[PDB]
Design an enzyme around this catalytic site. Sequence first.
Site, PDB file in Angstrom:
ATOM      1  N   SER A  31     -12.878 -43.480 -21.211  1.00 55.99           N
ATOM      2  CA  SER A  31     -14.259 -43.098 -20.272  1.00 55.99           C
ATOM      3  C   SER A  31     -15.145 -42.420 -20.834  1.00 55.99           C
ATOM      4  CB  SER A  31     -13.828 -42.713 -18.704  1.00 55.99           C
ATOM      5  OG  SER A  31     -14.399 -42.337 -17.761  1.00 55.99           O
ATOM      6  N   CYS A  68     -23.676 -45.935 -24.364  1.00 50.05           N
ATOM      7  CA  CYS A  68     -25.710 -45.777 -23.951  1.00 50.05           C
ATOM      8  C   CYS A  68     -25.946 -45.488 -24.166  1.00 50.05           C
ATOM      9  CB  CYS A  68     -24.853 -47.289 -22.526  1.00 50.05           C
ATOM     10  SG  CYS A  68     -24.220 -47.641 -21.777  1.00 50.05           S
ATOM     11  N   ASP A  77     -16.024 -56.069 -22.109  1.00 49.64           N
ATOM     12  CA  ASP A  77     -16.644 -56.643 -23.604  1.00 49.64           C
ATOM     13  C   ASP A  77     -15.446 -57.917 -24.313  1.00 49.64           C
ATOM     14  OD1 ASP A  77     -18.334 -55.490 -22.649  1.00 49.64           O
ATOM     15  OD2 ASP A  77     -18.606 -54.256 -24.679  1.00 49.64           O
ATOM     16  N   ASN A  94     -18.226 -52.562 -16.124  1.00 49.16           N
ATOM     17  CA  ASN A  94     -17.748 -52.088 -14.739  1.00 49.16           C
ATOM     18  C   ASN A  94     -16.871 -52.819 -13.666  1.00 49.16           C
ATOM     19  OD1 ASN A  94     -18.145 -48.486 -14.040  1.00 49.16           O
ATOM     20  ND2 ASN A  94     -19.000 -49.261 -16.593  1.00 49.16           N
ATOM     21  N   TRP A 137     -52.004 -57.149  -6.033  1.00 40.32           N
ATOM     22  CA  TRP A 137     -51.056 -58.101  -6.409  1.00 40.32           C
ATOM     23  C   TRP A 137     -49.143 -57.360  -6.831  1.00 40.32           C
ATOM     24  CZ3 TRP A 137     -51.087 -62.586  -3.607  1.00 40.32           C
ATOM     25  CH2 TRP A 137     -51.881 -62.911  -2.853  1.00 40.32           C
TER      26      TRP A 137
HETATM   27  C1  LIG Z   1     -25.519 -47.944 -28.970  1.00 42.62           C
HETATM   28  C2  LIG Z   1     -25.211 -48.516 -28.040  1.00 42.62           C
HETATM   29  C3  LIG Z   1     -26.723 -48.284 -26.615  1.00 42.62           C
HETATM   30  C4  LIG Z   1     -24.994 -49.339 -26.203  1.00 42.62           C
HETATM   31  N1  LIG Z   1     -26.845 -49.044 -24.532  1.00 42.62           N
HETATM   32  C5  LIG Z   1     -26.563 -50.082 -23.084  1.00 42.62           C
HETATM   33  C6  LIG Z   1     -27.451 -50.545 -22.203  1.00 42.62           C
HETATM   34  O1  LIG Z   1     -28.873 -49.153 -22.643  1.00 42.62           O
HETATM   35  N2  LIG Z   1     -27.080 -50.634 -21.150  1.00 42.62           N
HETATM   36  C7  LIG Z   1     -25.764 -51.800 -21.352  1.00 42.62           C
HETATM   37  O2  LIG Z   1     -25.247 -52.613 -20.605  1.00 42.62           O
HETATM   38  N3  LIG Z   1     -24.835 -51.440 -21.943  1.00 42.62           N
HETATM   39  C8  LIG Z   1     -24.969 -50.569 -23.610  1.00 42.62           C
HETATM   40  N4  LIG Z   1     -24.058 -50.935 -24.661  1.00 42.62           N
HETATM   41  C9  LIG Z   1     -22.973 -51.321 -24.207  1.00 42.62           C
HETATM   42  C10 LIG Z   1     -21.811 -51.204 -23.845  1.00 42.62           C
HETATM   43  O3  LIG Z   1     -20.715 -50.048 -24.384  1.00 42.62           O
HETATM   44  C11 LIG Z   1     -20.918 -51.881 -23.752  1.00 42.62           C
HETATM   45  O4  LIG Z   1     -20.610 -54.009 -23.319  1.00 42.62           O
HETATM   46  C12 LIG Z   1     -19.606 -51.149 -22.574  1.00 42.62           C
HETATM   47  O5  LIG Z   1     -18.887 -50.204 -23.168  1.00 42.62           O
HETATM   48  C13 LIG Z   1     -17.728 -52.149 -22.564  1.00 42.62           C
HETATM   49  O6  LIG Z   1     -16.569 -51.166 -22.615  1.00 42.62           O
HETATM   50  P1  LIG Z   1     -15.483 -51.923 -22.239  1.00 42.62           P
HETATM   51  O7  LIG Z   1     -14.357 -51.191 -21.702  1.00 42.62           O
HETATM   52  O8  LIG Z   1     -15.575 -53.612 -22.634  1.00 42.62           O
HETATM   53  O9  LIG Z   1     -14.444 -52.422 -24.137  1.00 42.62           O
HETATM   54  P2  LIG Z   1     -15.021 -50.531 -25.746  1.00 42.62           P
HETATM   55  O10 LIG Z   1     -16.323 -49.779 -24.586  1.00 42.62           O
HETATM   56  O11 LIG Z   1     -15.292 -52.036 -26.946  1.00 42.62           O
HETATM   57  O12 LIG Z   1     -14.455 -50.140 -26.369  1.00 42.62           O
HETATM   58  C14 LIG Z   1     -13.039 -50.082 -26.137  1.00 42.62           C
HETATM   59  C15 LIG Z   1     -12.218 -49.050 -26.520  1.00 42.62           C
HETATM   60  O13 LIG Z   1     -10.655 -49.313 -26.943  1.00 42.62           O
HETATM   61  C16 LIG Z   1      -9.837 -49.364 -27.896  1.00 42.62           C
HETATM   62  N5  LIG Z   1      -9.182 -50.772 -28.073  1.00 42.62           N
HETATM   63  C17 LIG Z   1      -9.342 -51.583 -29.020  1.00 42.62           C
HETATM   64  N6  LIG Z   1      -8.141 -52.770 -29.813  1.00 42.62           N
HETATM   65  C18 LIG Z   1      -7.014 -52.243 -29.076  1.00 42.62           C
HETATM   66  C19 LIG Z   1      -5.556 -52.102 -29.045  1.00 42.62           C
HETATM   67  N7  LIG Z   1      -4.716 -53.163 -29.988  1.00 42.62           N
HETATM   68  N8  LIG Z   1      -4.334 -51.119 -28.515  1.00 42.62           N
HETATM   69  C20 LIG Z   1      -5.337 -50.127 -27.422  1.00 42.62           C
HETATM   70  N9  LIG Z   1      -6.554 -49.867 -27.645  1.00 42.62           N
HETATM   71  C21 LIG Z   1      -7.006 -50.629 -28.542  1.00 42.62           C
HETATM   72  C22 LIG Z   1     -10.849 -49.159 -29.124  1.00 42.62           C
HETATM   73  O14 LIG Z   1     -10.746 -48.716 -29.889  1.00 42.62           O
HETATM   74  C23 LIG Z   1     -12.490 -49.380 -28.567  1.00 42.62           C
HETATM   75  O15 LIG Z   1     -12.553 -47.488 -28.323  1.00 42.62           O
HETATM   76  C24 LIG Z   1     -24.288 -50.273 -25.575  1.00 42.62           C
HETATM   77  C25 LIG Z   1     -24.039 -49.982 -26.786  1.00 42.62           C
HETATM   78  C26 LIG Z   1     -23.953 -49.112 -27.738  1.00 42.62           C
HETATM   79  C27 LIG Z   1     -22.646 -49.435 -28.947  1.00 42.62           C
HETATM   80  S1  LIG Z   2     -21.522 -47.536 -20.962  1.00 42.36           S
HETATM   81  C1  LIG Z   2     -21.426 -47.117 -19.402  1.00 42.36           C
HETATM   82  C2  LIG Z   2     -20.420 -47.937 -18.085  1.00 42.36           C
HETATM   83  N1  LIG Z   2     -19.087 -47.106 -18.837  1.00 42.36           N
HETATM   84  C3  LIG Z   2     -19.012 -45.911 -18.698  1.00 42.36           C
HETATM   85  O1  LIG Z   2     -18.186 -44.818 -18.564  1.00 42.36           O
HETATM   86  C4  LIG Z   2     -19.635 -45.350 -17.280  1.00 42.36           C
HETATM   87  C5  LIG Z   2     -18.949 -44.711 -16.573  1.00 42.36           C
HETATM   88  N2  LIG Z   2     -17.817 -45.199 -16.702  1.00 42.36           N
HETATM   89  C6  LIG Z   2     -15.957 -45.271 -16.348  1.00 42.36           C
HETATM   90  O2  LIG Z   2     -15.523 -44.776 -17.199  1.00 42.36           O
HETATM   91  C7  LIG Z   2     -15.718 -45.243 -15.220  1.00 42.36           C
HETATM   92  O3  LIG Z   2     -16.802 -46.369 -13.952  1.00 42.36           O
HETATM   93  C8  LIG Z   2     -15.143 -44.517 -14.288  1.00 42.36           C
HETATM   94  C9  LIG Z   2     -15.562 -43.477 -13.787  1.00 42.36           C
HETATM   95  C10 LIG Z   2     -13.583 -44.268 -15.209  1.00 42.36           C
HETATM   96  C11 LIG Z   2     -14.082 -44.920 -12.950  1.00 42.36           C
HETATM   97  O4  LIG Z   2     -14.999 -44.059 -11.897  1.00 42.36           O
HETATM   98  P1  LIG Z   2     -14.992 -44.753 -10.682  1.00 42.36           P
HETATM   99  O5  LIG Z   2     -14.555 -46.075 -10.354  1.00 42.36           O
HETATM  100  O6  LIG Z   2     -13.868 -43.325 -10.372  1.00 42.36           O
HETATM  101  O7  LIG Z   2     -15.969 -44.706  -9.701  1.00 42.36           O
HETATM  102  P2  LIG Z   2     -16.953 -43.723  -9.005  1.00 42.36           P
HETATM  103  O8  LIG Z   2     -16.131 -42.266  -8.314  1.00 42.36           O
HETATM  104  O9  LIG Z   2     -18.226 -42.735  -9.549  1.00 42.36           O
HETATM  105  O10 LIG Z   2     -17.456 -44.559  -7.780  1.00 42.36           O
HETATM  106  C12 LIG Z   2     -15.699 -45.018  -7.234  1.00 42.36           C
HETATM  107  C13 LIG Z   2     -16.487 -44.794  -5.346  1.00 42.36           C
HETATM  108  O11 LIG Z   2     -17.571 -43.973  -5.598  1.00 42.36           O
HETATM  109  C14 LIG Z   2     -18.469 -44.280  -4.941  1.00 42.36           C
HETATM  110  N3  LIG Z   2     -19.948 -43.887  -5.151  1.00 42.36           N
HETATM  111  C15 LIG Z   2     -20.550 -42.821  -6.420  1.00 42.36           C
HETATM  112  N4  LIG Z   2     -21.469 -42.826  -6.179  1.00 42.36           N
HETATM  113  C16 LIG Z   2     -21.999 -42.217  -5.480  1.00 42.36           C
HETATM  114  C17 LIG Z   2     -22.533 -42.049  -4.536  1.00 42.36           C
HETATM  115  N5  LIG Z   2     -24.335 -40.915  -5.724  1.00 42.36           N
HETATM  116  N6  LIG Z   2     -23.223 -41.996  -3.304  1.00 42.36           N
HETATM  117  C18 LIG Z   2     -22.622 -42.085  -2.247  1.00 42.36           C
HETATM  118  N7  LIG Z   2     -21.230 -42.763  -2.994  1.00 42.36           N
HETATM  119  C19 LIG Z   2     -20.811 -43.270  -4.207  1.00 42.36           C
HETATM  120  C20 LIG Z   2     -18.851 -45.655  -4.955  1.00 42.36           C
HETATM  121  O12 LIG Z   2     -19.388 -46.184  -4.114  1.00 42.36           O
HETATM  122  C21 LIG Z   2     -17.269 -45.578  -4.971  1.00 42.36           C
HETATM  123  O13 LIG Z   2     -16.328 -46.643  -4.226  1.00 42.36           O
HETATM  124  P3  LIG Z   2     -14.867 -46.960  -3.886  1.00 42.36           P
HETATM  125  O14 LIG Z   2     -15.277 -48.425  -2.423  1.00 42.36           O
HETATM  126  O15 LIG Z   2     -14.236 -45.585  -2.733  1.00 42.36           O
HETATM  127  O16 LIG Z   2     -15.009 -47.373  -4.659  1.00 42.36           O
END
Ligand SMILES: Cc1cc2nc3c(=O)[nH]c(=O)nc-3n(C[C@H](O)[C@H](O)[C@H](O)COP(=O)(O)OP(=O)(O)OC[C@H]3O[C@@H](n4cnc5c(N)ncnc54)[C@H](O)[C@@H]3O)c2cc1C
Ligand SMILES: *SCCNC(=O)CCNC(=O)[C@H](O)C(C)(C)COP(=O)(O)OP(=O)(O)OC[C@H]1O[C@@H](n2cnc3c(N)ncnc32)[C@H](O)[C@@H]1OP(=O)(O)O
Lengths: 443, 443
Positions: free
Chosen positions: B40, B44, B281, B303, B432
């Site tokens: 988690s 990004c 992904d 997500n 505009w």
């Molecule tokens: C530098 C960077 C910048 C980015 N900036 C942006 C942005 O500005 N906006 C945006 O939307 N997105 C951005 N992204 C994209 C984002 O990281 C991914 O699209 C997102 O994290 C989706 O994650 P996922 O859970 O599908 O899997 P991933 O995040 O790729 O990870 C899956 C994990 O599970 C593990 N796994 C793999 N195979 C196995 C197996 N066989 N058994 C057990 N575990 C395994 C891996 O080791 C891995 O670390 C960026 C990514 C990078 C790298």
């Molecule tokens: S590349 C970046 C994307 N990946 C990331 O790692 C970024 C973070 N993502 C995660 O790892 C997952 O999203 C995790 C956090 C592991 C899962 O989180 P949850 O599913 O528990 O998500 P939240 O607890 O953030 O939200 C769940 C419920 O919380 C409500 N909610 C969020 N934020 C707010 C605010 N600001 N105000 C009111 N409510 C809010 C969401 O509505 C959601 O509601 P449910 O209907 O209960 O799901």
Amino acid sequence: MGKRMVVVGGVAGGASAAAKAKRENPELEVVVYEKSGWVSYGACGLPYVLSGEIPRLERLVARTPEEFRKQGVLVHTRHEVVDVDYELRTLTVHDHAEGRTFQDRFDHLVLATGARPSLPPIPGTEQEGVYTLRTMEDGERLLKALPQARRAAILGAGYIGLEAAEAFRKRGLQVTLLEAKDRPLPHWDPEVGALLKEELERHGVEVWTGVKVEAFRGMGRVEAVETSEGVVPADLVLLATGIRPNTELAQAMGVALGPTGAIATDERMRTNLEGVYAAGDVAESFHRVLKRPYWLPLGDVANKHGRTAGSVIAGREARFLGVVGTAIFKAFDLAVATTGLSLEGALKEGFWAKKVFIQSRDGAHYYPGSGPLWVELVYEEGTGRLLGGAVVARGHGALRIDVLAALLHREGSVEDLLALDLAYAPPFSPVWDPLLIAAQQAR
Amino acid sequence: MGKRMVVVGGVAGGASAAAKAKRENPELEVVVYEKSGWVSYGACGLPYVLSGEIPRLERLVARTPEEFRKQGVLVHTRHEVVDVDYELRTLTVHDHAEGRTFQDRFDHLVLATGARPSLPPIPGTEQEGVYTLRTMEDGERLLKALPQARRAAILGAGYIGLEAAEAFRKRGLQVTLLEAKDRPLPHWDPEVGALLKEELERHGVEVWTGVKVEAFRGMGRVEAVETSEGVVPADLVLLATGIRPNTELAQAMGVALGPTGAIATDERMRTNLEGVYAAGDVAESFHRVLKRPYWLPLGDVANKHGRTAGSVIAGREARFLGVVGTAIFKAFDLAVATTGLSLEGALKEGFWAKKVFIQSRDGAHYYPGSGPLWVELVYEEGTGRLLGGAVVARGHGALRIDVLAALLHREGSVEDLLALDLAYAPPFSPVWDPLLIAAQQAR
Ligand SMILES: Cc1cc2nc3c(=O)[nH]c(=O)nc-3n(C[C@H](O)[C@H](O)[C@H](O)COP(=O)(O)OP(=O)(O)OC[C@H]3O[C@@H](n4cnc5c(N)ncnc54)[C@H](O)[C@@H]3O)c2cc1C
Ligand SMILES: *SCCNC(=O)CCNC(=O)[C@H](O)C(C)(C)COP(=O)(O)OP(=O)(O)OC[C@H]1O[C@@H](n2cnc3c(N)ncnc32)[C@H](O)[C@@H]1OP(=O)(O)O
Ligand SMILES: Cc1cc2nc3c(=O)[nH]c(=O)nc-3n(C[C@H](O)[C@H](O)[C@H](O)COP(=O)(O)OP(=O)(O)OC[C@H]3O[C@@H](n4cnc5c(N)ncnc54)[C@H](O)[C@@H]3O)c2cc1C
Ligand SMILES: *SCCNC(=O)CCNC(=O)[C@H](O)C(C)(C)COP(=O)(O)OP(=O)(O)OC[C@H]1O[C@@H](n2cnc3c(N)ncnc32)[C@H](O)[C@@H]1OP(=O)(O)O
Ligand SMILES: CC1=CC(=O)c2ccccc2C1=O
Ligand SMILES: CC1=CC(=O)c2ccccc2C1=O
């Protein structure tokens, strides 16, 4: 053909209309008669000039009478059209220069006379440090009085007015806001108003709510403002108590007024009289959520009005399709954006309407400098139909409001807002866009 | 019922699924196996940590294995599922801890194994200063190398990579970008890419275009990058040359791949096997302008995938309706957003497609610090159907793209864009909105 378009008033609807008309059909004789002696200036920037952020007031004009002339368009400032001989039958147009007074005819008439401060009936208004903010002249006046502070009173906490207090505070005066209703920005659900009280107060502005303003104390100068809640010392006061459309002239010539009291139009901006259009703030626009005529005296809508009348006169196909209510303004470190109906008002209209109000961020929890970002959603209980929302940010956008306005436009729903594929990246949004989290999503 | 949900991979698709399922049906046994030993976290944000803008790397995790446990969710990092006994018949899951190696069974399987760097076939990659940016560990590595500058090369001018260059310059290294195609951001119309070369050069980044990289020079270290256009001294090199989905495990178990190479899914995120879902992904999503499966390895979509699988598993009603391609990223003082198709690609698809590229502002002409703001619009000739668009700003938003996405969602047109009631006020937009001017509106 090669007819004569006369535009009465040339601030924004009027200017818009004339510029587009002449561009689209250069064969037209295009004349603008403007009472105020400046034309084509953005009033929307007045607070920024007052505040000193913008150096000179002329920096607000979009096109000068010169540039206009150089482009086929003849504008006359400090010209007042006094009567129109309409239908009846176009002699039409008596108006007044400097010195004289004369006749003109038209084949196309655009009314773009705008709107004027609506004044509450208070004794003392007539006096000397009492000001209004609406024209370039108001600009000049206010701008003279400002150095030489010392303490200001603003009646009304609307968008201008809140905008005003920022401006004033930036000039060093101590300012105190008096609104009659219970919150600032009374025209909208109280959450927002709350947020703005906080920010006003955070910046030194005193905010009196629920105040009946009894009179302005002075011997022709002004120094007080006696109110029900006590007496505010003040040596400049500003009336920011709403506007009303300048329709006097239109009613002379028997142009029909709609329910709101502005000029009734169609999708072509036509009035009831053949060859007479209306544009900007003297105009009714059609509200798409309310499904009826409605008054929306904004700058962007004045420009749309103008451009459609122009286009139509110039013989292009053009129609103005209506508005949904979107507005935005900046008070200090907040940017406040609404659209559609508030829950207060969605209920006046009898919808079975719930609101949700959330607070998120404007960037990832972890990203440097990421602000707070609230978003409301006013929706119909059963269907899920959106009807209104707000978003407030620090941000020079969000602005995200634009999405709601989008959804409002066609009759979209909360389900739709949820499906949207928004933009994510740590500097600009949490992983779930405020709009998305607010969608159904958290109570 | 009260079955067992096993989530392979817990970065973002996976984490999102686990948390949602356990919230929505706390009866479930939810276990997440994660290879990388962090879970988690937001990938990004990595550029922001590399740049020093964000102090410590752990600032990027969203939930800790502790907070997960405290919430019914058991995560096990450094655990890799090496085989699955599927269908066949769920014994299923063999996997590996620290020391040991064991079995587990499932009732529900979420595959969220994500993506790995796609490596180009260049000799000397195997070496010592050659780094990748995808996981936290990459983080750590890069983070170590970075003080002790001195001169970097980045291969690829995608979003990460462009984002990477900002980062590296911020740490003081001299950086030089190598792309094979003719522009930075080659996957979009050339106007945008142009804008970005100017901004990268303006900030001391040297950009080589149309370069064939031939090999990395070194005796196990690295110091060069021999290319067709000459020889770049570099002691750290980053491969920002795209990714490919981690599907090996899935194919083992006979989960069908789609035409993109990612795991094929339906609106519930179900794979072809009963009880096995895919998120993030490793997952195809459905592109709503292209009307077919497509691969959009973004974090906001992981997500979405995650939450949907989880909700469906837990027995709520949920569907993933698709994406439209919306992306945004920051490179220096520019914020670049896109969505839908580019013209280049709308044409590959056979639409009779035109484009329009305008430059406006991010606030009234007259307003202090108002920036530029470009916006493009890729549309179908006949119909006026929107198919793609971009917007670029300095702004922390505009972000205005969100609107096009919105229009893109149902099949909205340039006429529709034009009708929209957008927000105006001097600090945030010209009178505009840029979207509107761009709409038909200027060539
Ligand atoms: C530098 C960077 C910048 C980015 N900036 C942006 C942005 O500005 N906006 C945006 O939307 N997105 C951005 N992204 C994209 C984002 O990281 C991914 O699209 C997102 O994290 C989706 O994650 P996922 O859970 O599908 O899997 P991933 O995040 O790729 O990870 C899956 C994990 O599970 C593990 N796994 C793999 N195979 C196995 C197996 N066989 N058994 C057990 N575990 C395994 C891996 O080791 C891995 O670390 C960026 C990514 C990078 C790298
Ligand atoms: S590349 C970046 C994307 N990946 C990331 O790692 C970024 C973070 N993502 C995660 O790892 C997952 O999203 C995790 C956090 C592991 C899962 O989180 P949850 O599913 O528990 O998500 P939240 O607890 O953030 O939200 C769940 C419920 O919380 C409500 N909610 C969020 N934020 C707010 C605010 N600001 N105000 C009111 N409510 C809010 C969401 O509505 C959601 O509601 P449910 O209907 O209960 O799901
Ligand atoms: C302080 C302030 C802040 C604002 N901020 C914003 C904002 O942030 N966003 C936004 O969208 N809008 C804003 N507005 C609103 C905006 O001013 C109007 O909606 C817009 O300028 C519409 O212009 P119009 O051409 O219909 O007429 P108006 O601008 O009202 O002007 C018409 C002109 O024509 C003249 N005229 C009148 N009668 C006659 C006659 N009988 N003969 C000849 N000429 C005549 C008048 O003297 C007048 O000056 C703001 C307004 C003010 C005052
Ligand atoms: S409260 C603020 C509202 N009122 C104001 O006074 C603000 C300014 N408004 C005016 O007074 C009128 O709008 C004026 C300036 C009098 C009328 O102006 P025009 O109608 O001549 O407007 P422009 O020249 O600004 O635009 C007309 C054509 O120019 C194209 N265009 C504008 N901006 C751009 C950019 N940045 N890039 C490309 N093209 C651009 C418009 O598309 C428009 O197109 P046409 O299809 O030719 O009309
Ligand atoms: C409330 C919240 C929760 C997150 O999990 C999260 C993840 C990534 C960016 C921002 C956020 C955020 O604001
Ligand atoms: C090009 C341009 C033209 C305007 O007329 C205008 C009017 C008010 C604010 C901003 C602008 C602007 O950027």
